[PDB]
Design an enzyme around this catalytic site. Structure first.
Site, PDB file in Angstrom:
ATOM      1  N   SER A  57       0.804  -1.215   0.000  1.00  0.00           N
ATOM      2  CA  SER A  57       0.000   0.000   0.000  1.00  0.00           C
ATOM      3  C   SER A  57       0.842   1.271   0.000  1.00  0.00           C
ATOM      4  O   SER A  57       1.577   1.535  -0.954  1.00  0.00           O
ATOM      5  CB  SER A  57      -0.979   0.000   1.168  1.00  0.00           C
ATOM      6  OG  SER A  57      -2.115   0.785   0.842  1.00  0.00           O
ATOM      7  N   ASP A  83     -11.752  -4.132  -4.328  1.00  0.00           N
ATOM      8  CA  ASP A  83     -10.929  -3.342  -3.446  1.00  0.00           C
ATOM      9  C   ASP A  83     -11.505  -1.941  -3.271  1.00  0.00           C
ATOM     10  O   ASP A  83     -11.506  -1.142  -4.203  1.00  0.00           O
ATOM     11  CB  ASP A  83      -9.543  -3.278  -4.068  1.00  0.00           C
ATOM     12  CG  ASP A  83      -8.527  -2.657  -3.169  1.00  0.00           C
ATOM     13  OD1 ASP A  83      -8.909  -1.834  -2.306  1.00  0.00           O
ATOM     14  OD2 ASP A  83      -7.337  -2.997  -3.341  1.00  0.00           O
ATOM     15  N   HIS A 129      -8.402  -5.220  -0.307  1.00  0.00           N
ATOM     16  CA  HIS A 129      -7.128  -4.559  -0.050  1.00  0.00           C
ATOM     17  C   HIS A 129      -6.137  -5.353   0.818  1.00  0.00           C
ATOM     18  O   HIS A 129      -4.980  -4.950   0.953  1.00  0.00           O
ATOM     19  CB  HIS A 129      -7.389  -3.190   0.576  1.00  0.00           C
ATOM     20  CG  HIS A 129      -6.214  -2.262   0.531  1.00  0.00           C
ATOM     21  ND1 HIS A 129      -5.747  -1.703  -0.639  1.00  0.00           N
ATOM     22  CD2 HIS A 129      -5.427  -1.775   1.519  1.00  0.00           C
ATOM     23  CE1 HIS A 129      -4.721  -0.916  -0.373  1.00  0.00           C
ATOM     24  NE2 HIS A 129      -4.502  -0.947   0.929  1.00  0.00           N
TER      25      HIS A 129
END
Ligand code: CA
Ligand code: CL
Ligand code: ZN
Length: 212
Positions: free
Chosen positions: A113, A163, A194
């Site tokens: 991320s 996501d 995610h």
């Protein structure tokens, strides 16, 4: 261990594990938002147990949570801080390559991320900061920027289908941007939002054994 002066006075807090095999890439690890410099240690083990590990804690805090650069809100980056932190991290790989006596020009990043985003930012801004990169659930760091040539550079991108944070179209936008700069870009898909999944890590290991 005695690299104690650096560990305490460097631009960035981090841990370093000298590897069983020095010829292999030094694995640079970059946590996601709200994690820390230990989170991704399991990933390196699964990817290349023999490899040196440089794992870094971001220098920015968003409500008590370590981040690599400031954002106003999801998907809206402080673009002045992004470039400043990308430079900062690049100038840090410089000093860590000296201090821990490994090859500056052979580093591979595993990011998740927010951590993946600064890694992609390095790719964009600093031609030779990374030899390659595993990007778990990244976004496009910035748009409308001339990338340098990434000729001999390989990138793995793991994205999710369902996501709520990154749209799958933006994940492909990243792929294309990178290929247009002559990077070889493998792309794996998961359908579990995610979260970072075993599925993807196993595919990254596979990819990694073939690219390095
Ligand atoms: Ca608070
Ligand atoms: Cl982010
Ligand atoms: Zn995601």
């Amino acid at each position: 261990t005695e690299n104690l002066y650096f560990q305490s006075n460097a631009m960035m807090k981090h841990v370093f594990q000298k590897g069983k095999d020095t010829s292999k890439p030094v694995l640079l690890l970059l946590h996601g938002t709200g994690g820390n410099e230990l989170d991704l240690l399991p990933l390196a083990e699964i990817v290349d147990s023999e490899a040196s590990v440089l794992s870094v804690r971001g220098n920015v805090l968003e409500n008590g949570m370590p981040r690599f650069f400031r954002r106003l809100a999801e998907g809206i980056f402080d673009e002045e801080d992004l470039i400043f932190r990308t430079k900062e991290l690049n100038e840090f790989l410089d000093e860590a390559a000296k201090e821990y006596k490994f090859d500056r020009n052979n580093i591979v990043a595993i990011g998740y991320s927010n951590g993946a985003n600064i890694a992609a930012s390095l790719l964009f801004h600093y031609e030779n900061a990374l030899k390659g990169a595993v990007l778990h659930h990244p976004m496009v760091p910035r748009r409308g920027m001339q990338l340098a040539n990434l000729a001999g550079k390989s990138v793995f991108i793991a994205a999710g289908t369902n996501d709520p944070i990154c749209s799958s179209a933006e994940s492909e936008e990243l792929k294309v941007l990178l290929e247009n700069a002559n990077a070889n870009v493998t792309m794996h898909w998961e359908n579990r939002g995610h979260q970072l999944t075993m599925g993807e890590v196993e595919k990254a290991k596979e990819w990694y054994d073939k690219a390095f």
